[PDB]
Each structure stands twice: as C-alpha cells, then as structure tokens.
C-alpha cells in the first residue's frame, strides 16, 4: 500500500548493499536492484520504475517464492502492505455423497508494485514466514477492478 513520503520511517529505508557512490555524479540518484521471481511471473514495471522499499517484495526485496502457488479473491485491504483473501472450495462429504461450501482466509503480503482493491482475483506465492500469520505473497493480479468506470454518471 505504502504511497508518498517513501523515506517516512525512523530508520533510513534503503536496499541492502546497493551502494551509490556520491563521488560519481549520476543521473538517477538511486541505484535499484530487482529480479524475476521466476515460475513465469512478470516482474511488473512498477517494481523497476518504483522507489518504494519493501524488503518483503518478491521482485525488489529479499524473499524467495517457492512452495504452493494459490489463487483467491481479495476481501480485505485495510492492512498496510498486506491483504486478506478468501479461498472458497466445496468439501466432499461421503455418506451423503455431496459437497458443502467451505472457505479459508489467507493473509498475504502485498508489494506497492501492485494496486489491489477488494474483489480482485489475485495469485500468491508461498513464502518464508514473513509475519506471525502471513506465509504468502501477492505475485500477480488476475483481475482489474470489476468494470468500475462503467458505473459513472448519466447521459
């Protein structure tokens, strides 16, 4: 989520060991590192064009993506730089030979390279433990908004 200020903490936000020599007069001020997480996920330009710092970003930060790759729909965006998705699924009861609707809510970190709204289907990649509960990271937005601009005024 981040937005504005970027240098808004008590500590200086920077990328580890990405020294920029001040002697060397340069036109871009800050040298910035990045990668592609692989598995086929484009490292969106807003990660390379970005100036945010998030060490928990899978493109600009020091996290690796491995283990389960999951999709689920976004249902909470109130946590600064993280969200809560719901993954629905039917569950088979034998004896009755039918299923029942179930769900779980997975908490997952979301880098300022994505701009996620409630309702967006999102794909996340499993993580090293990143917080008390978050074990996933938003790796791609599948959605958009859900035709919001096609909710405008009158003729």
């Amino acid at each position: 989520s981040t937005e504005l200020t970027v240098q808004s903490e008590r500590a200086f936000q920077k990328q580890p060991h990405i020294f920029n020599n001040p002697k060397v007069k340069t036109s871009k001020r800050t040298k910035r590192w990045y990668k592609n997480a692989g598995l086929g996920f484009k490292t969106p330009k807003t990660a390379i064009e970005g100036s945010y710092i998030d060490k928990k970003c899978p493109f600009t930060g020091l996290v690796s993506i491995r283990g389960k790759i999951l999709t689920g729909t976004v249902v909470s965006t109130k946590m600064h730089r993280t969200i809560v998705i719901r993954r629905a699924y039917l569950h088979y009861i034998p004896k009755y030979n039918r299923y029942e609707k179930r769900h779980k809510n997975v908490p997952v970190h979301v880098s300022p390279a994505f701009r996620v709204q409630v309702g967006d289907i999102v794909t996340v990649g499993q993580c090293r433990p990143i917080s008390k509960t978050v074990r996933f990271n938003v790796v791609k937005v599948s959605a958009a908004a859900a035709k919001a601009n096609k909710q405008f005024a009158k003729f």
């Binding site: 009861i93 009755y96 039918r98 609707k101």
Partner: protein, 144 residues
Amino acid sequence: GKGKPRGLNSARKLRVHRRNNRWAENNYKKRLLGTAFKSSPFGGSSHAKGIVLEKLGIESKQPNSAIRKCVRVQLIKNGKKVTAFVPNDGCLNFVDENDEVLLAGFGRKGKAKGDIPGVRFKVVKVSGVSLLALWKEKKEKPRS
C-alpha cells in the same frame, strides 16, 4: 420430494439435520449425555459390589400375589443405596445383614424385571462365593 433437500451441495444441511434428530434416539442421547456415568447406581460398569443393609419382603405386582425377598445394598465405590433381588428358593437364608454381595443387572436395560417393583438388580454372590453354588451344595459360606 418432501423435506430432505436433494441438492448436490446440500451436504451440510443434510448432516446437521441428522445430528439434530439423533437426539430423538434413546440410546444416542443416553450415550452422549453419559447417563451411564452420571445417574444410574452402577458406575456404568457391568456389576458392582456392595453391603447388605436390610432384608426386605417386597410384595409382587398384580395379577401376581407373592412376597419377593430382596436386599437393600449400599454400593461400595459409590455409597449409593440400592434394592436387589435374591433369586431361587431360599437364598434369603444365605445372605444376612452387613454381608458383602455382588450385584448385577436384570437384563432389561435398567428397568425392573416382572412383578418385582423397583428392583433393577439381582444378587450373584455373597461372601465371595455365588448364590448359585450355595443353592446347590457345591460350595459353602465363609467363616465370618
């Protein structure tokens, strides 16, 4: 179709609904309340051993006429006080007050036998030996 949802996802309704109506089953409710362990003289166990308080003379129910010869027993593990039947001709001669006896069920899932009213148990042994053997002659009652 009457009642029961036929749907392909209605499993949850279908289970819950059952859960609910199992309670109308006398054995399922008994099991889960633990009526066995809670109420009921015996611990839940099959027999239990107590001490003889008074020799009684229960008069049978109609259309029977009899005096039915029983013992009030105080269950050892329990203190709970219970009246028990002493079967076969005599045998009330075998017991005596303050003697130990091994009570057992009557084979009716709780519930009294026939014309004996109130009695839900029967005597099986006294002073560690067995009414049955005593009744015959295969064994003898212990010292004191």
